[PDB]
Amino acid sequence: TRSEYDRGVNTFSPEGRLFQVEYAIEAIKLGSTAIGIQTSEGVCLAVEKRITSPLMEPSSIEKIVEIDAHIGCAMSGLIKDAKTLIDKARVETQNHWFTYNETMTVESVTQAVSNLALQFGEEDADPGAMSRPFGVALLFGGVDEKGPQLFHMDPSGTFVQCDARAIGSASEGAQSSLQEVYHKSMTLKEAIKSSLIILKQVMEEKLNATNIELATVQPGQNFHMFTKEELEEVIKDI
Amino acid sequence: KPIRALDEGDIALLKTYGQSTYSRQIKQVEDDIQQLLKKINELTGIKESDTGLAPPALWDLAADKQTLQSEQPLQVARCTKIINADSEDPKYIINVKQFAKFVVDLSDQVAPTDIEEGMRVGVDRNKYQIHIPLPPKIDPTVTMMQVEEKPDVTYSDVGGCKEQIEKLREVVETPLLHPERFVNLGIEPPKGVLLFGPPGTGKTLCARAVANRTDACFIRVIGSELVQKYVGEGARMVRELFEMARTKKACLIFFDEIDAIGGDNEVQRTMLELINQLDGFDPRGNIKVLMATNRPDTLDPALMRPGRLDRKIEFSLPDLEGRTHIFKIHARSMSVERDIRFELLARLCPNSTGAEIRSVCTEAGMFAIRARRKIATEKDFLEAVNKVIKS
Amino acid sequence: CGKTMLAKAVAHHTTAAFIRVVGSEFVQKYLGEGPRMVRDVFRLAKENAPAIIFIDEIDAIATKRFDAQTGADREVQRILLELLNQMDGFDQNVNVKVIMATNRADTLDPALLRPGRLDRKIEFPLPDRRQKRLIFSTIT
Amino acid sequence: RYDSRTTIFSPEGRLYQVEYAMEAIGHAGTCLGILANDGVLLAAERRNIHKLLDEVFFSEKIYKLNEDMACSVAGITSDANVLTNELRLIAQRYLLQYQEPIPCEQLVTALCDIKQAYTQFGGKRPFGVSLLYIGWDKHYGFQLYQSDPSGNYGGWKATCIGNNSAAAVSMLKQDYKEGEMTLKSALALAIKVLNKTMDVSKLSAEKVEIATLTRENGKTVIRVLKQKEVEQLIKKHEEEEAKAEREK
Amino acid sequence: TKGPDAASKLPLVTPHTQCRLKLLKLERIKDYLLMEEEFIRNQEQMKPLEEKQEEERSKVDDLRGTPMSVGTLEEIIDDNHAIVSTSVGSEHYVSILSFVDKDLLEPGCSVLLNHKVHAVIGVLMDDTDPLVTVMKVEKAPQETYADIGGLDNQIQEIKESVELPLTHPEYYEEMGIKPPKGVILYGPPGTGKTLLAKAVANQTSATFLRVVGSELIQKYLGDGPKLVRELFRVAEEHAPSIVFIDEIDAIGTKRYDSNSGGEREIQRTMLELLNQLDGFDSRGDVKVIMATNRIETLDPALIRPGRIDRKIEFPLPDEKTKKRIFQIHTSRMTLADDVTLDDLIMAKDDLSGADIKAICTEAGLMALRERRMKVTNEDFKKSKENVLYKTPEGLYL
Amino acid sequence: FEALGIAQPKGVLLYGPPGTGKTLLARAVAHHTDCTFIRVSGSELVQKFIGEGARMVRELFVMAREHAPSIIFMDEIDSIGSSRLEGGSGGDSEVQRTMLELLNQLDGFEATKNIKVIMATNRIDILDSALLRPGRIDRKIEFPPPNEEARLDILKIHSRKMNLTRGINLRKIAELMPGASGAEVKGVCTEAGMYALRERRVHVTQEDFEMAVAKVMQKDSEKNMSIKKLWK
Amino acid sequence: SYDRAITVFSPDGHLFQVEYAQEAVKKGSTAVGVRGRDIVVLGVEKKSVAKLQDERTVRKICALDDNVCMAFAGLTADARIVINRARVECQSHRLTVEDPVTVEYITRYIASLKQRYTQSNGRRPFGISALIVGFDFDGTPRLYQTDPSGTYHAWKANAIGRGAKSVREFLEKNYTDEAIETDDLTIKLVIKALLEVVQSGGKNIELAVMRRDQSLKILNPEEIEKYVAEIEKEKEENE
Ligand SMILES: Nc1ncnc2c1ncn2[C@@H]1O[C@H](COP(=O)(O)OP(=O)(O)OP(=O)(O)O)[C@@H](O)[C@H]1O
Ligand SMILES: Nc1ncnc2c1ncn2[C@@H]1O[C@H](COP(=O)(O)OP(=O)(O)OP(=O)(O)O)[C@@H](O)[C@H]1O
Ligand SMILES: Nc1ncnc2c1ncn2[C@@H]1O[C@H](COP(=O)(O)OP(=O)(O)O)[C@@H](O)[C@H]1O
Ligand SMILES: Nc1ncnc2c1ncn2[C@@H]1O[C@H](COP(=O)(O)OP(=O)(O)O)[C@@H](O)[C@H]1O
Ligand SMILES: [Mg+2]
Numbered sequence A: 001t002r003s004e005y006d007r008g009v010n011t012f013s014p015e016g017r018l019f020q021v022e023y024a025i026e027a028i029k030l031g032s033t034a035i036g037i038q039t040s041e042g043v044c045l046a047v048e049k050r051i052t053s054p055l056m057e058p059s060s061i062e063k064i065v066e067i068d069a070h071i072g073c074a075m076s077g078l079i080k081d082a083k084t085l086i087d088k089a090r091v092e093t094q095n096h097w098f099t100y101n102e103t104m105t106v107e108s109v110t111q112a113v114s115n116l117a118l119q120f121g122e123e124d125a126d127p128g129a130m131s132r133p134f135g136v137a138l139l140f141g142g143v144d145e146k147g148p149q150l151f152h153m154d155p156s157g158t159f160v161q162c163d164a165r166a167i168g169s170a171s172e173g174a175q176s177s178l179q180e181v182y183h184k185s186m187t188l189k190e191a192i193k194s195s196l197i198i199l200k201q202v203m204e205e206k207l208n209a210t211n212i213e214l215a216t217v218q219p220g221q222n223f224h225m226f227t228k229e230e231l232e233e234v235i236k237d238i
Numbered sequence B: 001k002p003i004r005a006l007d008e009g010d011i012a013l014l015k016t017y018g019q020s021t022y023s024r025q026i027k028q029v030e031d032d033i034q035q036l037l038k039k040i041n042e043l044t045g046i047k048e049s050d051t052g053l054a055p056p057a058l059w060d061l062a063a064d065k066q067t068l069q070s071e072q073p074l075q076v077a078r079c080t081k082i083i084n085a086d087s088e089d090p091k092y093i094i095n096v097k098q099f100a101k102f103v104v105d106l107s108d109q110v111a112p113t114d115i116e117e118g119m120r121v122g123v124d125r126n127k128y129q130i131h132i133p134l135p136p137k138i139d140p141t142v143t144m145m146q147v148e149e150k151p152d153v154t155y156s157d158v159g160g161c162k163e164q165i166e167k168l169r170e171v172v173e174t175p176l177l178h179p180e181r182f183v184n185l186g187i188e189p190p191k192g193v194l195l196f197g198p199p200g201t202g203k204t205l206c207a208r209a210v211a212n213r214t215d216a217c218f219i220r221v222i223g224s225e226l227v228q229k230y231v232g233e234g235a236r237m238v239r240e241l242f243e244m245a246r247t248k249k250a251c252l253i254f255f256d257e258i259d260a261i262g263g264d265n266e267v268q269r270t271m272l273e274l275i276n277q278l279d280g281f282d283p284r285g286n287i288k289v290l291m292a293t294n295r296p297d298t299l300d301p302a303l304m305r306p307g308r309l310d311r312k313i314e315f316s317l318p319d320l321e322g323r324t325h326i327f328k329i330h331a332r333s334m335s336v337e338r339d340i341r342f343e344l345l346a347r348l349c350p351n352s353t354g355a356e357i358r359s360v361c362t363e364a365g366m367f368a369i370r371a372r373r374k375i376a377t378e379k380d381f382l383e384a385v386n387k388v389i390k391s
Numbered sequence C: 001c002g003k004t005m006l007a008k009a010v011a012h013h014t015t016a017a018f019i020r021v022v023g024s025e026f027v028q029k030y031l032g033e034g035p036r037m038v039r040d041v042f043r044l045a046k047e048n049a050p051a052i053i054f055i056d057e058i059d060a061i062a063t064k065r066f067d068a069q070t071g072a073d074r075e076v077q078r079i080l081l082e083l084l085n086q087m088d089g090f091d092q093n094v095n096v097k098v099i100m101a102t103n104r105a106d107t108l109d110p111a112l113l114r115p116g117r118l119d120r121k122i123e124f125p126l127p128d129r130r131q132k133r134l135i136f137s138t139i140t
Numbered sequence D: 001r002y003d004s005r006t007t008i009f010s011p012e013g014r015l016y017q018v019e020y021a022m023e024a025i026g027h028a029g030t031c032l033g034i035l036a037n038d039g040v041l042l043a044a045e046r047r048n049i050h051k052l053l054d055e056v057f058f059s060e061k062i063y064k065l066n067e068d069m070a071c072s073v074a075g076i077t078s079d080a081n082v083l084t085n086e087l088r089l090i091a092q093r094y095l096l097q098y099q100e101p102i103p104c105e106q107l108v109t110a111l112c113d114i115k116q117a118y119t120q121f122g123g124k125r126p127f128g129v130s131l132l133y134i135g136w137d138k139h140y141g142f143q144l145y146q147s148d149p150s151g152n153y154g155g156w157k158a159t160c161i162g163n164n165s166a167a168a169v170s171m172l173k174q175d176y177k178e179g180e181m182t183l184k185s186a187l188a189l190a191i192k193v194l195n196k197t198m199d200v201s202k203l204s205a206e207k208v209e210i211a212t213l214t215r216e217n218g219k220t221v222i223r224v225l226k227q228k229e230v231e232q233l234i235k236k237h238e239e240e241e242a243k244a245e246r247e248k
Numbered sequence E: 001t002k003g004p005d006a007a008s009k010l011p012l013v014t015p016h017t018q019c020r021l022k023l024l025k026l027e028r029i030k031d032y033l034l035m036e037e038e039f040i041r042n043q044e045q046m047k048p049l050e051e052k053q054e055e056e057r058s059k060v061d062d063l064r065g066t067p068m069s070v071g072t073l074e075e076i077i078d079d080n081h082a083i084v085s086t087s088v089g090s091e092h093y094v095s096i097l098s099f100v101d102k103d104l105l106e107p108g109c110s111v112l113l114n115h116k117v118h119a120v121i122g123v124l125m126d127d128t129d130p131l132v133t134v135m136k137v138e139k140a141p142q143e144t145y146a147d148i149g150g151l152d153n154q155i156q157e158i159k160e161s162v163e164l165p166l167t168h169p170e171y172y173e174e175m176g177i178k179p180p181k182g183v184i185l186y187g188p189p190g191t192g193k194t195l196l197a198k199a200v201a202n203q204t205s206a207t208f209l210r211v212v213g214s215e216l217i218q219k220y221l222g223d224g225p226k227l228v229r230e231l232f233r234v235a236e237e238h239a240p241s242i243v244f245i246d247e248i249d250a251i252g253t254k255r256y257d258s259n260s261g262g263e264r265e266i267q268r269t270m271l272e273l274l275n276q277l278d279g280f281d282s283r284g285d286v287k288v289i290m291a292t293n294r295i296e297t298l299d300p301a302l303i304r305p306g307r308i309d310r311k312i313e314f315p316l317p318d319e320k321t322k323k324r325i326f327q328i329h330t331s332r333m334t335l336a337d338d339v340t341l342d343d344l345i346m347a348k349d350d351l352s353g354a355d356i357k358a359i360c361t362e363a364g365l366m367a368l369r370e371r372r373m374k375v376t377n378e379d380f381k382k383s384k385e386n387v388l389y390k391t392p393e394g395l396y397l
Numbered sequence F: 001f002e003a004l005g006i007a008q009p010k011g012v013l014l015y016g017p018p019g020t021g022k023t024l025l026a027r028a029v030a031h032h033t034d035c036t037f038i039r040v041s042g043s044e045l046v047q048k049f050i051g052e053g054a055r056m057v058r059e060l061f062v063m064a065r066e067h068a069p070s071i072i073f074m075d076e077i078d079s080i081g082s083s084r085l086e087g088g089s090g091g092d093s094e095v096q097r098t099m100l101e102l103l104n105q106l107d108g109f110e111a112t113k114n115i116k117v118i119m120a121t122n123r124i125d126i127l128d129s130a131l132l133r134p135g136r137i138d139r140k141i142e143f144p145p146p147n148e149e150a151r152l153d154i155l156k157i158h159s160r161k162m163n164l165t166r167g168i169n170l171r172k173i174a175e176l177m178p179g180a181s182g183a184e185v186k187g188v189c190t191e192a193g194m195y196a197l198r199e200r201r202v203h204v205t206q207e208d209f210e211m212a213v214a215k216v217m218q219k220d221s222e223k224n225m226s227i228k229k230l231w232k
Numbered sequence G: 001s002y003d004r005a006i007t008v009f010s011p012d013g014h015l016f017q018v019e020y021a022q023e024a025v026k027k028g029s030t031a032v033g034v035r036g037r038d039i040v041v042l043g044v045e046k047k048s049v050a051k052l053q054d055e056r057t058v059r060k061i062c063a064l065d066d067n068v069c070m071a072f073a074g075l076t077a078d079a080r081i082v083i084n085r086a087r088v089e090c091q092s093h094r095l096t097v098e099d100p101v102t103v104e105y106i107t108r109y110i111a112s113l114k115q116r117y118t119q120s121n122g123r124r125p126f127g128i129s130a131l132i133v134g135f136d137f138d139g140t141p142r143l144y145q146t147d148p149s150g151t152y153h154a155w156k157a158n159a160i161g162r163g164a165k166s167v168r169e170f171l172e173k174n175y176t177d178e179a180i181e182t183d184d185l186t187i188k189l190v191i192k193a194l195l196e197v198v199q200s201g202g203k204n205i206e207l208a209v210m211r212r213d214q215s216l217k218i219l220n221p222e223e224i225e226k227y228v229a230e231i232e233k234e235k236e237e238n239e
């Protein structure tokens, strides 16, 4: 009889599981597929748009956003949940650029965001905060003093450094494909080609310019989201 | 406003004035049309029903009279307890269907060794003496039984049950095809296994596949079959099935939808007969029992006792790799393109039972037929899974 | 307060055809047997002389109708509806007066408490002063 | 089911507690008001006058709020009193802050916001009170607004709320000539509506509660019809009904 | 096996204005009806054909005797004796006489028995107890796919399920998919389920067996499953055939542990129906169609994908379907030119096909109330609320 | 109906408060009609034996068809056709089977002809939606409690046989009955007659009618004033 | 079960209270807004007042600031509350930054308000969807839809409320680049979309047009008859 423990996050299963947190985890699969890959030359983030109507403004739907010029993001889950998460992340990065006047590392970015996360069952919510686990899985990538770095965040608050992680509806299959398609010496161009290959194999529709949002972060330049022409260039090869 | 009832003049004027000039002949003609249909129906006749009369020169009408005047009919009955006969109480209580029950003594043409409880026996009218035992006979055309010696489904046609099929391998392949290992390990081979899981999971199909690959004939025992009309003598029916399994080199006895039997007077007689044919029958035999139900707990507690049912096996819903594998195995028999992203379909149908996936493939074929295309596209599969899945 | 006793006295002091039933007696095991018995008792009263049907504890079956969600409640309300249609239905009864007694009149169905079915709803209050004297005198 | 605290949403989207707060007004006393060419009035039913109520009051169903604001109440007595007191507080807070009598629409919206806040959040039962504010403002002259326990409102020239409100408002809209009634014809119409909607062959002036709002000489006067006045009006309507039936 | 049934007469309705084109067409129909009547009358007027065998037939009848009781051959023994159960239910070990066609004896076939000393003396292949005979459609309903407005997807699905396999089925095994054995119609009441069943039974080429669902239940023990078995045996015997079980929720409700004998018999009847539905191959040309309003209350084993794959949804008609239905049901009317009909369709309501038909009928009645038959727009305006009896205003605005 | 092009109406439901003229109207219709009127008042179709209710429904409709254009009066249709209950276990199903058979007979595959049917109930709101459906039940006639003129008419009908006195004003008596059903009006007539009988007279006076109105209409109010004053 | 709790994830990962509040909009009324080259239009179905309602106070279309407008679908009390809060926030934003509030800012504020109202128990979500329209400082036409889930999205022409799917498909089939060339073409499109669901025409439709900082005037019920005369004229013109 699980039913007595799913009601509420502050319950413990006979197997010691957090059923509310597990449901939040599974709620990630409701979101669109997001794939990020880490290479020596940088990190690239590929996502699916899942456009509901051609009359939609594609700029509104945001699967990848900028927390700071040196770092990038990817989302899978509730739009508003991730909106609060990203706003907090940007506020935190400016907090660091205020306190230490430096660019704060991506591992610390996911540290602070996970600090905002996993706070659902915390008494400090008296002013007002999450009474429910945050329902978005986060993909953080960028370049810091340790070179290019990509971190995947779990709505439970867990983070892990991942060379190539896939979140969203097709996380299992995309991860399985990335398992054999990834090599350590992969160049940025061939990595992005492989990422769009995985998206093509995974996405429910054909790949056009309005089906993919593409992002890149390299030590040289700042965060660049691929424009329409850059997206066409990177998709015409595939 | 007080609305006036239409007067007789008003009825008369409504019937005319605002009428087509052909109302009269049209209505009259249609009335005669219906009348003529009724006349044709009433006088067309019925035609002779053709009773079962054999072609001439086949009839022995003289000997027919001889039999009708000499040979006598016998009522048939479900014989019961022998009253502990010992040749001084040859009477048995016998049940003539919905008629009463009678204690009756044998005819001189029969011997008590040929009569035991539970069998159908022909009894005379005058004294109700059992005149001849009538075995219920065994025939694949009657009942619904094994009707299979080498099922056409192999391990290829079953997918998404890898741990499931591996446990089944442990259950059946190791004792049947490698008896020496349990001989020199001094361990009794598994005596009974229950394959419990939700409907449409593949229990029946996995059992049939393992039957094909175990070089043993598959047995199909539908429960509602012997809950319905073929009840009662079903004990002797399964008795004969098990006996032929003894004669057969190896049978894979699986009782389909045992939810219908495990959940009881003749039902209890039956499962105690299997008590005699697993407990009484040696546990070493090659006719191992296979149990599969939609309701696991429904099976009587005396059945799964240690020394009757060694294992219990859970058939869960197929996973992502399982769902894509069943999609492939079901679309192999279908006209589709060679670039169907089956992984996409498996992803799009979460927590979907195997029957739902086969119905999805069927609906994809239906959508392909709808557009009168000989080859189904990925689009057809997408709309089919939009239709079946999500209900 | 004297309800069943007044029914008893009426049964004694009558030339009429008295049929005594209790409410709980109507509710039968088998489906459709309760309404059948209501039909039978009223039919027996009709085919006899000027008759009296006394149904004690009518709140057993004549509780206010509601949205029955079970077979049993539906059957009880079916018994009540058969009672209504027998008392003041399509084919009327002649010289069949029905006496019905209950402890809780307010829980009775309003369709049963209308003139033409229960023309007179007679209240049997607790004795008042003089009534107490009369009861004491007639019992002592 | 979804009949728990008001902060719930039925799968079809209905707010069942708010729905019940709606239908609960059908148990309240019947009160109406209509908009005349040069006057506005509130007519209400005194449902509970058994024998021994002191009638130590100026009006029960009608509650005055301000030199320009008056309303009629229909709901639970406790929520009625709370709503009236909050109405007074908000109206006079606006007067103190702005040195102008509060516009009827603004005060109505203030009450509606409070009522919504009482069903929007907090796990508190919504005010089960439906109001009929009557008043004047220089922006739109004479205005009448019909409140709602749900927190909505509407500007109406004819509206009845309470028991038997549906039939009353249906016949009222059947017999409303907009823009061409004075105070006298409006009084006659209200009395006829009460005749048709109350459970009495001859309604007594005691059961009737009428207050009229009228602007004259640069000032708005709110007066409840005195017993002599209300009895004269009801007797006039009674002989008018007699005239109608004798002509019929 | 023999062939299908349900002969119907001609659609006519090529005109419908009684412009004498209807008259020539009905005149042709009636004239040919007269031709059939005269031909068969004159045939039976001169048709001398009898006797021939006689004495052999006479003596086989003498052996048969009178009466001969029909029984159900439950089981066969060595080919001189068999087991036959009389209609009472008691079964006897009897002898089979020489003149019976041993090929015809098959478990289930009705066998003629001698009244005294029971013995198989003939075989009846057309027992067809009156209940199942009544359940068979003889005069096809007059409705047609032209009479159905909207439901294009529903008509399309029902034709793909119970017309396409009976007509050219080469696509089905070309694609390797089995034809859909059984379809079920569901939706709110009065949406077009029974109407679609009538329409299918009209443009059909197979035996149509209409069933009430609650008709299958019988008082006597074992009569229910026996009736279901006989009904489906007739369906196979007259293949291809369509078995329409209206109001399937009369028996298709949730299966639960039976206690009373009647509940046990109902469960047994449903189990027999389900087993029979499994019994015939989907490649077989007998299809079942069941309709119900309370789809959720059905047994989730009656609607298993291996049993009843298709599930046709009948939503309340949309605005365009409403206007199609209104065009259909006002077609016969002599509508005045002022009627727009779009105001009623506009009104956001739950008007069904039946509701539209009733609105039209009430509008005609109201026109008759004013002694007219031209039916203005005002008649529809009042009829709408006359028929439509029975969200608190400003909640959701 | 054929010339208009409309379809013939089939059923009609008489719903309203308890005692208004529903069964009275059905009785009158039976009196004034040449059709073979049929009284099948509800719960007569509920048999102990399984599946017998549907069989009786079929037999009733086949008998109505075999006869002339007929009228079936299903009085208190609230009994058998109320609402299909989910599942079995404790919920009724046999009555649901009978009701479904009735529904199919009314408007199903066969499309019965000249079998106009009347049904009555006090609770229309609980009747099954598939039974209230137009085409099976059109013209859901409401029998509201009589208004003052209707109450006067009912009084003048039921006091027709009475020995009234000169000076009786039945209009005042009708006015003394706000929202009184017709059955209550007949009961008032009866009780005034009984008041005349008690004094062993034969005339009924106005005071007799006033006291009869007081006695019949007497009903228990809310005794507790405080509970009564919850609402304004 | 999992439905009667605003902040409890279902086993399949749904906040069912949020989706029920979202569905509550579908029981409102149709409100379609289109943005043109220089204009933005708001077409809403007006409830035909029976005999006595004052249409002055039945406001379905309201302007948050002189540079933004909005139409709502859902419960009117919630819409009034969010209107008051959002216009108060527009004024406070002008207090903080002195420049006119951009449509993005006010839409983000509305979405955040709805979201903070749907993340804790004891606070029922705002069951209203609002179409935000307006021009920025550089006069770019932007239109936003806010969803009771607390999210927002940029729509070129969207419809909400009952029948919003039909209007959505209509706009998909009819929204062209040349259909917004002139103000009259945008108007023709919006009235066509409106009459798709409210076929009665004439009344029961309200329109508002915002040009490049004209402080929009709702189209008054004199040229709605004129504009519908134009619509009917063009309608009999192509057919
Ligand atoms: N799409 C339609 N076009 C025309 N007429 C329709 C349509 N749908 C329904 N009708 C009308 O509705 C009437 C009753 O419908 P029908 O008998 O098919 O009901 P149903 O939906 O099967 O409901 P139920 O089985 O619950 O009684 C039909 O006689 C027909 O005239
Ligand atoms: N309008 C009326 N005119 C005359 N007599 C009436 C009227 N209404 C009711 N009655 C009388 O009152 C009684 C009402 O009984 P009736 O069975 O006709 O009522 P009903 O409305 O069918 O009630 P029920 O809900 O119990 O079926 C009858 O005896 C009848 O004579
Ligand atoms: N693991 C599987 N591999 C292949 N087919 C499967 C599998 N599971 C289910 N199916 C499909 O499901 C259908 C019915 O399965 P079945 O064995 O009847 O289910 P149950 O286990 O309830 O008896 C079969 O046609 C089969 O194709
Ligand atoms: N008026 C009375 N005179 C004498 N005895 C009475 C009177 N009323 C009640 N009783 C006593 O009370 C009992 C009456 O019970 P009764 O009122 O019939 O029960 P119920 O009210 O449950 O029908 C009798 O046994 C009788 O002894
Ligand atoms: Mg007693």
Ligand SMILES: [Mg+2]
Pocket: E190, E191, E192, E193, E194, E195, F107, F108
């Ligand atoms: Mg139907």
Ligand SMILES: [Mg+2]
Pocket: C085, C088, C089, C090, F022, F023, F075, F076, F120
């Ligand atoms: Mg009655």
